[PDB]
Amino acid sequence: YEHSTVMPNVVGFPYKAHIERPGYSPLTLQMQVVETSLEPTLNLEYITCEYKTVVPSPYVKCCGASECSTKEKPDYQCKVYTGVYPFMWGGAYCFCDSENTQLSEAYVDRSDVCRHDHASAYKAHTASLKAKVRVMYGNVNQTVDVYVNGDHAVTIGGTQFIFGPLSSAWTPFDNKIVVYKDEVFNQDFPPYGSGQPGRFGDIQSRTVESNDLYANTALKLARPSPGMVHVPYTQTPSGFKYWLKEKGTALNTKAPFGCQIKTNPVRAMNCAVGNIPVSMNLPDSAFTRIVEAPTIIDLTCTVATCTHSSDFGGVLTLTYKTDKNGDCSVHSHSNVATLQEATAKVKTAGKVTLHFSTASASPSFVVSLCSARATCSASCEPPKDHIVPYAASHSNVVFPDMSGTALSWVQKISGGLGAFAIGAILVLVVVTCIGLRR
């Protein structure tokens, strides 16, 4: 038997679906979302880490000159300084008084730990939602891992389940992303081959193990001071270390809809938005023949107490009379009130009690025990507590019933004014018809 429903994408909300097959007693099965995960598809642009400047010993040629030789090294700098006269601890070498020369070289490289401490720059698109759902009905109670798209069918107790695509296409990750350790930054980074000194990305590499490197750190050589050997230089400090101090916030602490950002792999979890369509295919052994199901007549519903709090703050009593003792399946045909359970024990004594949660001043909903029906209406009082550590068990429906006190009063007033208008219309009609008849 095929059935289709829609359940809210809320973790911990007890969804209950009511199946009413023509030949069998009604069935109520409970579905709950234990967990959720939403992962974008990432393709790596480059990585960044702190650099390291390589400065070899200067070549001081005495009594002669040297020539600078170009090399294919990242941000390579080389210059030749003439007229040097260095000293060392024992004396001054370069016997020639002023026909000497020094060669200074410097380049940059990735730091020795770039495979341990680095940041990845990604582009994110087309997230896929996975879920973990517990389904329970009859003697079946079991939890499954599913892909939330119309392209994954699972079997639970012989029943086939397909959890269709999510209602909305909202994702918290925008086009460009930067990942550092276990923190995701919702950032726009410079293109590859176009990094700037002192900012994020002043050195860029396609992969951790890649061999070529791009570097732009404004490294510049300077003339050595007279009488000493040292190779001076100036270089703008690392842009990775500057990002580490001026990165700003994170997506972990900003994300809407209250969802946790995890890394490795990058994902957003328990992120309450949208609805999940569900398609079902049940066997005939899930139901019960309407013969051995109990027969209930004269179903009366009276509300004992009500207070529209987050938990199950209303109590409900049903009176009936039955021919045989057995089990029935209760259900509330409105989302104004959410019931605690999906099954009751019927006995010849004729009294069952059950708990419901609502959020409106005066609810009115129809409840059904096996095949019977009844209408329940109540007047509920506000709670006194201001703040609670748990989420609502209701659907946040507030608009009151037409028989409730507020709308009853409005109905009385509007009816009085309408009667006044109708009477005046009749008076004018009679007078104008008399005027016409003359």
Ligand X SMILES: *[C@@H]1O[C@H](CO)[C@@H](O[C@@H]2O[C@H](CO)[C@@H](O[C@@H]3O[C@H](CO)[C@@H](O)[C@H](O)[C@@H]3O)[C@H](O)[C@H]2NC(C)=O)[C@H](O)[C@H]1NC(C)=O
Q: Which stretch binds another protein (CB under 8 A): 160-168, 201-209, 327-335, 377-385?
A: 377-385
Exactly one of 150, 258, 415, 416 binds another protein (CB under 8 A); that residue is 258
Q: Which is nearer to ligand X, 161 or 200 (CB)?
A: 161
Cα 420 vs. chain centroid, distance in angstroms?
A: 56
Work out which of 218, 297, 304, 391 binds another protein, going by CB under 8 A: 391
Window 180 to 199, contacts with a copy of itself (CB under 8 A): 191-194
CA–CA separation, 267 vs 241, rounded Å? Answer: 26
Q: Which residue has the tokens 């909903």?
A: 365
CB of 107 to a copy of itself, least distance (A): 17
Question: Count of CB atoms within 10 A of residue 158's CB?
Answer: 12
Q: Residue 95 touches which of another protein, a copy of itself, ligand X, none (CB < 5 to 8 A by kind)?
A: ligand X
Residue 388 touches which member of a copy of itself, another protein, ligand X, none, C-beta under 5-8 Å by kind:
another protein
Residue placing its CB nearer to another protein in the complex, 186 or 357: 357
**Residue 9: closest CA among 341, 271, 269:** 271
Nearest residue (CB) to a copy of itself, 121 versus 380: 121
Residue 218 within binding range of ligand X, rule CB under 6 A:
no
CA distance linking residue 161 with residue 155, whole number of Å: 6
Q: Which does 391 bind (CB under 5 to 8 A by kind): a copy of itself, another protein, ligand X, none?
A: another protein
Angstrom distance (rounded) from CA 163 to CA 133: 10
- DSSP secondary structure code for residue 207 in this structure: S
Which residue, 267 or 308, has its beta carbon nearer to a copy of itself? 267
Adjacent-strand bridge partners of 78: 105
Sequence-ordered list of residues with C-beta below 8 angstroms from that of 6, at least 6 positions apart, any chain = 275, 276, 277, 278
Residue 155 sits in the site that holds a copy of itself (CB under 8 A): yes
Q: What string of DSSP letters covers 366-385?
A: EEEETT--EEEE---BPPS-
Among 6, 63, 218, 428, binds ligand X (CB under 6 A): 63
Q: Which of 196, 197, 193, 217 lies closest to 205, judged by CA?
A: 193
Decide: 393 and 335 in contact? Cβ < 8 Å: no
- The two structure tokens encoding residue 419: 């009667």
**Chain positions contacting another protein, by CB under 8 A:** 253, 258, 308-310, 359, 361-362, 379, 381-392, 396, 398, 405-406, 409
Q: Which residues of the shown chain bind a copy of itself in the complex (CB under 8 A)? A: 41, 43, 45, 125-126, 128, 147, 150-155, 160, 162, 191-194
Residue ranges binding ligand X (CB under 6 A):
63-64, 95-96, 136, 141, 143
